Amino acid sequence: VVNPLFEKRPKNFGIGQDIQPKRDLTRFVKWPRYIRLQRQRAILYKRLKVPPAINQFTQVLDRQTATQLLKLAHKYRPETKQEKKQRLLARAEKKAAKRPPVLRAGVNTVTTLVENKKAQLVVIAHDVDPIELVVFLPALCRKMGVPYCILKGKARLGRLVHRKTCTTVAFTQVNSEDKGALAKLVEAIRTNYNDRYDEIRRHWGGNVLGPKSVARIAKLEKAKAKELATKLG
Amino acid sequence: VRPKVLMRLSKTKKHVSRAYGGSMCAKCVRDRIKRAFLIEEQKIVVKVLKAQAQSQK
């Protein structure tokens, strides 16, 4: 039934036995300088002892609480400039014949309305490039009793507004309908960030050795515990 | 003939009708055939002899 000519010719990829096959080498590529720099700075944020003021941005809001937060904020999106046109032309036809609650974007607008306690909730993005723009902000919201949370990604936070990115977004007022939705998220948020404040201030980050180096000391200690395992009995 | 002239010459002027013809001398070809054959025959007697080893142990 089978053609007897069909024979299987295996290859022995032993040392000096046969040419090696094209296997994946993504772990040995000589990457460009902009990639090496890009990567070994994410390693530095694990080796060095990150101070708590910067490390507090890794303790981030979880997945599903983020989404429901965004589903809430998606109805307080500020008017795009099409409707800004559509809003005043409806203001024109009445003269020839109040403002709803909106979101608030930008640190410079947020910190003021946090310093005036007009905010009910403020969201901060963890990946701000010059982190100095937001470092103070968690410590400030706690000091003035404002619920604050941290969302992963200024991009998805910059998509609420129709910009590219956005550092912070604050809730000043909401409509009567989704006042309980906001209220439940607030107590779901301050229970992790605000009331756990002094717990964060003593939390340094990084200080993690590489997986290749921890395996070396753990081999020397497991071999240290192995002979002491038989030392007394 | 000088190298750039070998463009003109036909094929038969530049080689010999034989494997490696025009690249290797005949006597070094037949020693290359004997070598390639005896080596493979030597691998056979090694592979079938070590097949006996896995029956003995």
Binding site: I15, G16, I19 | -
Partner: protein, 199 residues
């Protein structure tokens, strides 16, 4: 007030080496998986005379393990090497003359040459004509090895770095007297402009 001869040699431009007819840099094969975990077979293609160097070189042809190709090298011939001889390189390589293998694998008193002073620098030590180094003693932990050098100095090198077994070919060269001032002229004319030495 004038710059003396010894100072003018650092600028070069007349005291540079004469490297027109030098065959190449005589180095070892670069470290790779084969040389680190097994051995690799190479053939001594030819033994050639390098101008300005007493020790002869040896074109050794290997079979590249990743591409269909034949990589060629320029070892420093160990005395006793002949053309058509198989040279083996690596950790599993046997101990015969003209086999480069890591020093830590060799027994004590092993006569080596073209030794690496740091693991993977393609040989730096004991590579003049007729010289050699001896593996004095090992140290399993810390992976270190003591070897004495042709100067008599003993040195603690890493166990990973490797060396070709046997002395360097062309020994006994300094025994024949340069008889003529002419022979000395031709010797240095192949190396660098340094010979007629006004005191």
């Amino acid at each position: 007030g004038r710059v003396i001869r010894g100072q003018r040699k650092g600028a070069g431009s007349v005291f540079r080496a004469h490297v027109k007819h030098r065959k190449g840099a005589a180095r070892l094969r670069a470290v790779d998986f084969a040389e680190r975990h097994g051995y690799i077979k190479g053939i001594v293609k030819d033994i050639i005379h390098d101008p300005g160097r007493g020790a002869p070189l040896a074109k050794v042809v290997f079979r590249d393990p990743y591409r269909f190709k034949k990589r060629t090298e320029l070892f420093i011939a160990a005395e006793g090497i002949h053309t058509g001889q198989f040279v083996y390189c690596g950790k599993k390589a046997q101990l015969n003359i003209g086999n480069v293998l890591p020093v830590g694998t060799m027994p004590e008193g092993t006569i080596v040459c073209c030794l690496e002073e740091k693991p993977g620098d393609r040989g730096k030590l004991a590579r003049a004509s007729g010289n050699y180094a001896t593996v004095i003693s090992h140290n399993p932990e810390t992976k270190k090895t003591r070897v004495k050098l042709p100067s008599g100095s003993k040195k603690v090198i890493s166990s990973a770095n490797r060396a070709v077994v046997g002395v360097v070919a062309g020994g006994g060269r300094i025994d024949k007297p340069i008889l003529k001032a002419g022979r000395a002229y031709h010797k240095y004319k192949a190396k660098r402009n340094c010979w007629p030495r006004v005191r």
